[PDB]
């Protein structure tokens, strides 16, 4: 009894995802058969029609509807010119879960498409191709992505807390590093058959945990947010070979190519390359932002007859724009640029404010068209250039030999990475604990395997902690049932000295997959103390109700110190 729908202002459906119960209910209601998308559109048209009028008149939009006892929950969100609708009817997900799912879907759209998602006209065509087979294939791929995301959120702690988990083995990690360096990146780079593709990063994945990672000397460090999406994409194809997929990640949204080569069951290898025409996207992004500032002051400011021509920003934008036009020389964009050059810089007849607004809008769409023609039609899934088949086979076969003797040990160690017993003696009464570093995005937590009862209580603490953090509360201690929960937030420096606490701003959802909230929090504190480094830490612990509160705090503090000394 679930449904996720994306619709435009004209009640046109672009993407839908329904389960068996919703489809059966719709069949029963409308069967007293047309396409499911048509039925959903004709059923949900009034909401879409009524939503726009509210924004047009009172500058307000509906956010959520609620029924008695919370039987049905409706969530609405306007992402630019598109409306996102989430429907729940089985009490399994709350409003926050639906909002997080919508934000995850929007982030997936960003990763899959790029800067094109900003333009509402092109995204409608991209999500609804004229060809039926391509549309069906894309819809099935996105439905599979949503299903695997939902499964991973309910089975894995890594997506439950949105943090990176690593397998600790000093002997194996080193050998993995030299094996990767010698036989993957160097093998691809030194091969003359690479066809201009440059290898940057390559990592080995076991289950939902990271084992080794290496980067080239000419590559930028990946943000922790992108690697969670990479892990989700890898898990979708091979749940616990397919052609390369074009992906976009923050370095802008520079293009990248994805390669997935499986080694065994539960062990996968991921390789990433970069197109030689990559820095063209940076120029396009600067031009995309440059015209936005020009349009911003065209509406707010006075008559643009003479004021804009003296602005250094316009001159800087002109110095950037004319260089781009001369370097390209495209007839379609040169004629419009000359038309806008005459309008903006004529000493006799400057363009009108209304006329200049339409001229700037036309140039905005043309720049996105060049990006679409360059970094999305040349995707490797549509016949684009890619690594040859035998080159991929050589890497896959050669990496297997280096890890042949460590197959059985890796699987056993993965299920028993951290033992709770090893901490029972030092910290009696402890049941479960989650240690997450918000600076590097890494988490330290044992492997949970009565077992279901404690497993369910883990999500309750996580959901409650996020809700209270949003309104400016840094800590939360509460007892529910026979267990005692905890949540702690504090700031430290690189050397380990204590730092003072400031007022957290009161409020986008809290997380790292669909955006970020911790990076902006660190910058806010650094504004007042630029001379000191800032680090962020979190700690979730579960204790029995028998332990007193005073003893609980001392036990929690000792655990954090021991983990800090064990790390680094």
């Amino acid at each position: 009894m679930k449904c996720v729908l994306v619709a435009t202002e004209g009640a046109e459906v672009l993407f839908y995802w329904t389960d068996q119960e919703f489809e059966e209910s719709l069949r029963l209601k409308f069967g007293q058969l047309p396409a499911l998308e048509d039925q959903l559109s004709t059923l949900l048209a009034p909401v879409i029609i009524s939503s726009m009028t509210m924004l047009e008149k009172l500058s307000d939009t509906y956010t959520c509807f609620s029924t008695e006892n919370g039987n049905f929950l409706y969530v609405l969100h306007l992402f630019g010119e598109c409306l996102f609708i989430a429907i729940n009817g089985d009490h399994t997900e709350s409003e926050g879960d639906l909002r997080r799912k919508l934000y995850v879907l929007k982030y997936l759209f960003e990763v899959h498409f790029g800067l094109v998602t900003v333009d509402g006209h092109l995204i409608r065509k991209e999500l609804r191709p004229p060809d039926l087979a391509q549309r069906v294939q894309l819809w099935e791929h996105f439905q599979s992505l949503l299903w695997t995301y939902s499964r991973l959120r309910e089975q894995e702690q890594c997506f439950a807390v949105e943090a990176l988990e690593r397998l600790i083995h000093p002997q194996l990690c080193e050998l993995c590093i030299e094996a990767l360096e010698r036989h993957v990146i160097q093998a691809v780079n030194t091969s003359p058959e690479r066809g201009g593709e440059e290898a940057l990063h390559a990592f080995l994945l076991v289950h939902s945990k990271l084992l080794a990672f290496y980067s080239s000397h000419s590559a930028s460090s990946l943000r922790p947010a992108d690697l969670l999406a990479l892990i989700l994409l890898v898990q979708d194809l091979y749940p616990s070979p397919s052609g390369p997929r074009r992906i976009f990640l923050d370095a802008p949204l520079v293009p990248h190519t994805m390669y997935c080569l499986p080694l065994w069951q539960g062990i996968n290898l991921v390789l990433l390359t970069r197109s030689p025409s990559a820095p063209l996207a940076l120029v396009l992004s600067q031009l995309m932002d440059g015209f936005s500032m020009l349009e911003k002051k065209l509406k707010e400011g006075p008559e643009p007859g003479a004021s804009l021509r003296s602005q250094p920003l316009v001159g800087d934008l002109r110095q950037r724009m004319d260089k781009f036009v001369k370097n390209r020389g495209a007839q379609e964009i040169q004629s419009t640029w000359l038309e806008f050059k005459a309008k903006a810089f004529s000493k006799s007849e400057p363009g009108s404010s209304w006329e200049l607004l339409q001229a700037c809008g036309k140039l905005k769409r043309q720049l996105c068209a060049i990006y679409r023609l360059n970094f999305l039609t040349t995707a490797p899934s549509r016949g684009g250039p890619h690594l040859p088949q035998h080159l991929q086979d050589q890497v896959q076969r050669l990496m297997r030999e280096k890890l042949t003797d460590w197959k059985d040990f890796l699987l056993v160690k993965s299920r028993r990475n951290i033992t709770m017993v090893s901490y029972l003696e030092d910290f009696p009464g402890l049941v479960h604990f989650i240690y997450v570093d918000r600076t590097t995005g890494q988490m330290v937590a044992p492997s949970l395997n009565l077992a279901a009862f404690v497993k369910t209580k883990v999500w309750s603490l996580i959901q409650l902690a996020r809700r209270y953090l949003q309104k400016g509360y840094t800590t939360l201690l509460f007892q529910e049932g026979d267990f005692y929960c905890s949540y702690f937030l504090w700031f430290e420096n690189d050397m380990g000295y204590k730092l003072q606490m400031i007022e957290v701003p009161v409020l986008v959802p809290i997380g790292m997959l669909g955006g970020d909230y911790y990076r902006k929090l660190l910058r806010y504190y650094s504004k007042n103390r630029p001379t000191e480094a800032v680090r962020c830490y979190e700690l979730l612990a579960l204790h029995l109700s028998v332990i007193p509160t005073d003893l609980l705090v001392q036990q929690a503090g000792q655990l954090a110190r021991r983990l800090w000394e064990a790390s680094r």
Binding site: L43, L44, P46, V47, S50, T53, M54, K57, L58, D60, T61, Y62, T63, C64, F65, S66, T67, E68, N71, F72, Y74, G89, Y468, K471, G472, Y473, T474, T475, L476, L477, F478, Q479, E480, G481, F488, W490, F491, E492, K498, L499, Q500, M501, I502, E503, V504, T549, D550, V553, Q554, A556, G557, A560
Partner: protein, 381 residues
């Protein structure tokens, strides 16, 4: 910003076709000085959204929330009730307030369909305006948060007078009030608020007005509208209110009871009439009583106290198995404990760095809460 913003009724029978204007479908609206276009737009949008959600989900919606506003909607036959709230308010508080307004309308004017089919619009509109004025005059912060009532050998005889009345023929329950201060009452708290908020504006100073009690309240009085009669008597400072029966329209019995004690009640009345270091709030779930120590002037510290209770009050109503909850920020910490009988909230009016020290004063509020509150008679078990 006012917590209570909008309140209007829509009738779907008068507007059935697309060409029928929705202006005639508005029976009442507050404020009355607003423009007509906004009225029509809001009514049409709300009615359309409610109808569409009811059609899709086979159940009418009970809450519509926007970025700046929050609407509580309930359906009663062909009439639609819409309530205007603020974002900061809890949803349960708005639902209870809307239910209270509906109950007041039913107990004051009977069924809506019969009242609008028999009576004119202007008189009910004036009554609504006056009653909204009273309700807006009688609202406070803790009353917004908890929705409680607007509330000793002398009390013994004051209640004995009522006890002698209950025996007096055809009596269910009664109460005695002094300028909004409760002396002794036997009615349920839901109807006690209705009697107390009744603006007190044949023997002299004797008035009898029929009322309409719901079956659940009528059963409670005896232990879906039922007609009863309210006896209102105006004294210099005292008021006596009795709900007896439908054919009340006994005689000379209640007349003698007051005049046998008028010189004693007023004489007893005139005899009666003639830097906090911590904040606390105690709420009784059974009697819906509220008592706390907050200054009339909202200091910046007091404003932060009200916000903390807002989230914590709603958390208890959703998790019946949750007992203890404490929070702390960069400036303050608030403790809470809940049992199926009563709730308690404590804050100290007197900055954490790094991981919390076990000797932190914020984490030791449990011991201080039970000891400090015993002074004002607040008995914590």
């Amino acid at each position: 910003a006012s917590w209570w913003n909008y309140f209007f009724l829509y009738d779907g029978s008068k507007v059935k076709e697309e060409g029928d204007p929705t202006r005639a479908g508005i029976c009442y609206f507050y404020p009355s000085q607003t423009l007509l276009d906004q009225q029509e737009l809001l009514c049409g949008q709300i009615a359309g959204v409610v109808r569409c959600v009811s059609d899709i989900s086979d159940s009418p919606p009970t809450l519509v929330r926007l970025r700046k506003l929050k609407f509580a909607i309930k359906v009663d036959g062909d009439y639609l009730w819409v309530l205007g709230c603020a974002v900061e308010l809890p949803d349960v508080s708005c639902k209870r307030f809307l239910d209270q307004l509906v109950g007041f309308f039913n107990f004051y004017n009977g069924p809506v369909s019969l009242a609008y089919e028999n009576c004119s619009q202007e008189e009910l509109s004036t009554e609504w305006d006056t009653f909204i004025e009273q309700i807006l005059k009688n609202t406070s912060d803790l009353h917004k948060i908890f929705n409680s009532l607007w509330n000793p050998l002398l009390l013994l005889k004051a209640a004995r007078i009522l006890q002698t009345c209950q025996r007096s023929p055809h009596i269910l329950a009664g109460c005695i009030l002094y300028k909004g201060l409760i002396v002794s009452t036997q009615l349920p708290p839901s109807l006690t608020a209705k009697v107390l908020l009744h603006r007190t504006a044949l023997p002299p100073n004797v008035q009898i007005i029929p009322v309409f009690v719901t079956k659940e309240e009528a059963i409670s009085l005896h232990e879906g509208l039922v007609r009863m009669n309210l006896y209102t008597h105006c004294v210099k400072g005292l008021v006596l209110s009795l709900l007896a029966e439908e054919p009340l329209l006994d005689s000379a019995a209640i007349e003698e009871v007051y005049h046998s004690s008028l010189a004693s009640l007023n004489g007893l009345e005139v005899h009666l009439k003639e830097s906090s270091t911590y904040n606390f709030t105690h709420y009784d779930r059974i009697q819906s009583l509220l008592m706390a120590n907050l200054p009339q002037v909202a200091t910046p510290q007091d404003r932060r106290f009200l916000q903390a209770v807002s989230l914590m009050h709603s958390e208890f109503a959703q998790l019946p198995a949750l007992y203890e909850m404490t929070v702390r920020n960069a400036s303050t910490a608030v403790y809470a404990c809940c049992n199926p009988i009563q709730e308690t909230y404590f804050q100290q009016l007197a900055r954490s760095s790094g991981f919390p020290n076990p000797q932190d004063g914020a984490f030791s509020l449990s011991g201080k809460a039970k000891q400090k509150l015993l002074k004002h008679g607040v008995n914590l078990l």
